[PDB]
Amino acid sequence: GMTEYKLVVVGACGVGKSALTIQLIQNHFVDEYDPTIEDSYRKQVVIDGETSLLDILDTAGQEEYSAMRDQYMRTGEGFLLVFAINNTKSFEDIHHYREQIKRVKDSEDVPMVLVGNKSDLPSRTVDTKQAQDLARSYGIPFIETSAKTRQGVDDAFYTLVREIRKHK
Ligand SMILES: *CCC(=O)N1CCN2c3ncnc4cc(-c5c(C)ccc6n[nH]cc56)c(Cl)c(c34)OC[C@@H]2C1
Numbered sequence: 001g002m003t004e005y006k007l008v009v010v011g012a013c014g015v016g017k018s019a020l021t022i023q024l025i026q027n028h029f030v031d032e033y034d035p036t037i038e039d040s041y042r043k044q045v046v047i048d049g050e051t052s053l054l055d056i057l058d059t060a061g062q063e064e065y066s067a068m069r070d071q072y073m074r075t076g077e078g079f080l081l082v083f084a085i086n087n088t089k090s091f092e093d094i095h096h097y098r099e100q101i102k103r104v105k106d107s108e109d110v111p112m113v114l115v116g117n118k119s120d121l122p123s124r125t126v127d128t129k130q131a132q133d134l135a136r137s138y139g140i141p142f143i144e145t146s147a148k149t150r151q152g153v154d155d156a157f158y159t160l161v162r163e164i165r166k167h168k
Pocket residue numbers: 010011012013014035036059060061062063064065066067069070073096097100101104
């Protein structure tokens with residue numbers, strides 16, 4: 001019947017992964033979401049006139065390697081790489097998330113999107129141009145998002161879907 005996409009949302013602790021995913025699915029902003037909850041969220045959506053199913057895995061757990069986490073990641077068709085623009089270490093870590101995904105996919109061209117989250121915060125420490133240059137060198141799109149104001153949430157997930165469709 002209707003297509004399903006496995007989206008995986010990766011990024012450092014407290015970048016807004018669950019806030020983004022919950023805003024897309026449930027249309028509200030979470031203030032203090034339980035940071036151990038790793039669950040899968042679904043939504044029916046119309047993208048370029050195609051009704052589709054989003055299965056969104058919102059990563060949590062521990063900073064540790066597991067055979068079981070390789071398996072969940074290998075099921076993923078595309079990945080949002082999320083940093084907050086007020087945390088330069090969250091952006092320093094994007095490199096390791098891309099490396100870890102290349103290892104399990106044993107692929108250079110995995111549908112990915114770079115997300116600079118918390119675009120509403122005054123206190124920016126990571127500059128758009130640097131984020132842009134990183135996405136241009138990975139060959140992936142870049143979207144600035146605020147889970148609070150909902151700016152760029154839709155277009156971040158939809159751009160990932162459109163990256164997975166271009167992939168075959
Ligand atoms: C506050 C908790 C939270 O949101 N976290 C902390 C734990 N991680 C995390 N931290 C470090 N390394 C990680 C590595 C992977 C991973 C990847 C990308 C591919 C294959 C893997 N095999 N074992 C682990 C991994 C992931 Cl998915 C995470 C992670 O998930 C994010 C999460 C963020």
